[PDB]
Structure 1
Amino acid sequence: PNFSGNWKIIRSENFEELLKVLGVNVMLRKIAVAAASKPAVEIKQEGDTFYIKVSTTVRTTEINFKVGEEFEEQTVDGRPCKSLVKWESENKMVCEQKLLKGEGPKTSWTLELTNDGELIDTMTADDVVCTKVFVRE
């Protein structure tokens, strides 16, 4: 499994709903949903070391991590967290997030590469799940 590539979105579900249940107000949701409904996703994978760049009309997020080693991130609604990615299976990784301060919904993201070569991303807050599917350019 090599997640490396530039990935282009073909399906999305529940993105605004995820922001809504996290408490994001409607004005900010509409900006977010417009800016981030065709996110460009680039991955460079070198074994267990990953670089991910997600680009929207208003934000560039670059993440660098090694599977099994804690790193710093912010949650999708902007709260500082410490993150840790593990392999769930050979083709799917899960990022658990812990808030640095205070309490809040349990948040995570996952990335899975299917046999057919699609990339499935999920982002969760408690029991609400956003799912996006991409193909390699």
Structure 2
Amino acid sequence: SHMCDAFVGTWKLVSSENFDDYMKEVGVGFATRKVAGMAKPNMIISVNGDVITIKSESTFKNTEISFILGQEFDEVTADDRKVKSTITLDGGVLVHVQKWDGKSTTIKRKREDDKLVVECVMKGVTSTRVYERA
């Protein structure tokens, strides 16, 4: 209990850096990269018992994942990859690993001051996305 209290709430994207390059490395095609890169999502995080729910809502897509820390799940990503995901808490950081087709990407979510900072890594390429409370 209270594991993720500082994450819970509704968060609005305020900045993004290198997301197009991250998406290229993941294999996202041109048209999806353009439309997804233009998205300004709200991220809605909630907790009920051991179950964490993360929603991303934008003009591009509305996604929702629910999961228990450490317990793998199947996820269809906004770009329509079918991935195996596992999310854990590591020293206060939510660490989300997605595996598909022999590839892997890791998305980290952390609280820093009044922001929620999301770092998306695929091999050598990192994208940083900053959110503030809505």
* TM-based fold match above 0.5: yes
Aligned equivalents of 2:60, 2:47: Cα separation in 1: 25
Which residue identity does 1:70 align to in structure 2? E
Which piece of structure 1 moves more, 41-50 or 8-17?
41-50
Query: Shift of residue 66 of structure 1?
Result: 1.1
Q: How does 1:72-91 map to 2 (within 5 A)?
A: 72-75=74-77, 77-89=79-91, 91=92
Which residue identity does 1:125 align to in structure 2? M
Determine the structure 1 residue equivalent to 2:126: 129
Cα distance change, pair 76–122 in 1 and its aligned pair in 2 (3 A): farther
Gap regions ≥5 residues in structure 2: none
How many residues align? The count is 130
- Match for 2:105 among 97, 107, 114? 107
Aligned equivalents of 1:117, 1:49: Cα separation in 2: 24
Moved over 4 A (4+): none
Matched, 1:57 2:59: yes
Cα distance change, pair 25–70 in 1 and its aligned pair in 2 (3 A): closer
Aligned equivalents of 1:46, 1:117: Cα separation in 2: 23
Aligned equivalents of 1:21, 1:103: Cα separation in 2: 14
The Cα offsets for residues 26-59 of structure 1, whole Å up to 9 and x where unpaired, read as 333222212x2x1111111346431111011031
Secondary structure, counterpart of 1:69 in structure 2: coil
- Match for 1:8 among 8, 12, 18? 12
Cα distance change, pair 75–107 in 1 and its aligned pair in 2 (3 A): farther
Secondary structure, counterpart of 2:20 in structure 1: helix
The Cα offsets for residues 100-120 of structure 1, whole Å up to 9 and x where unpaired, read as xx323x212111112x23101
Alignment RMSD (CA, Å): 1.9
Query: Is the contact between residue 45 and residue 52 of structure 2 (CA under 8 Å) also seen in structure 1?
Result: yes
Determine the structure 1 residue equivalent to 2:28: 24
The Cα offsets for residues 57-82 of structure 1, whole Å up to 9 and x where unpaired, read as 03110010111111111356432111
Aligned equivalents of 2:22, 2:75: Cα separation in 1: 18
Cα distance change, pair 27–98 in 1 and its aligned pair in 2 (3 A): closer
Determine the structure 2 residue equivalent to 1:92: 93
